Design a protein around this ligand. Sequence first.
Ligand SMILES: Nc1ncnc2c1ncn2[C@@H]1O[C@H](COP(=O)(O)OP(=O)(O)OP(=O)(O)O)[C@@H](O)[C@H]1O
Length: 248
Amino acid sequence: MGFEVVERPNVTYNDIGGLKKQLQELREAIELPLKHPELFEEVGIDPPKGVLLYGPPGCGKTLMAKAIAHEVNATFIRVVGSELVREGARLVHELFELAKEKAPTIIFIDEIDAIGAKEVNRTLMQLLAEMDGFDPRGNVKVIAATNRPDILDPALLRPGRFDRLIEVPLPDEFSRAQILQIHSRKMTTDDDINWQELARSTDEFNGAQLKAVTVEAGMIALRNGQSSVKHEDFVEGISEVQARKSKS
Ligand SMILES: Nc1ncnc2c1ncn2[C@@H]1O[C@H](COP(=O)(O)OP(=O)(O)OP(=O)(O)O)[C@@H](O)[C@H]1O
């Protein structure tokens, strides 16, 4: 095993709420040079080998990464940084070898800070070696995620590495309403549902907690033997997810 391999992920840009601007930057960074690498050679600019997504948990970094891979017909391989801390230089190598074999590939490195906090450590040094190894205009791209871009060893941020940075922030009020709608699409909801009030009531929620709200709302409707989900069900679901946060 070692790291998640997904032959072709079934996630699209329509599954992502809000994030239009940051999704566009990532598409311009990875999708454009994959679909039309010849343009980047004509103009004489090396596209980025690594894109670092940063921001708080559950705001859709992983989503975006899977969605890119889908659009561009690539394999998606995921490693978790905290799992790479024990060996593991060997594992980073096997990762990039496989990724080349199953190319086109999108490598997603979660929690990169676990490995690259600031003659460097042996696992981190493999990541550096592997990225200097493969060339841009090539068809293996790396995407990394972290809370703390400030705590990263500046060696990761040097040219030819993760020299393209995108902030993936908490959803704004409009985004939150989209996120709830998106995760309610498979589920019959009343016409009388006020998505925008629900969005006002979820100040500081992330995408994962908004999805969880949809899930509890659906579960409350079930326990009540309803055949559709009511506004008051979403309001109780918000209240439940807020309770769980408090129970870290
Ligand atoms: N903008 C969004 N639109 C739709 N769903 C979202 C969004 N953000 C988060 N979610 C939901 O929450 C779940 C977790 O999100 P995701 O794993 O992408 O967050 P993250 O930024 O990768 O956090 P981390 O990598 O630190 O765990 C996803 O499965 C997704 O379904």
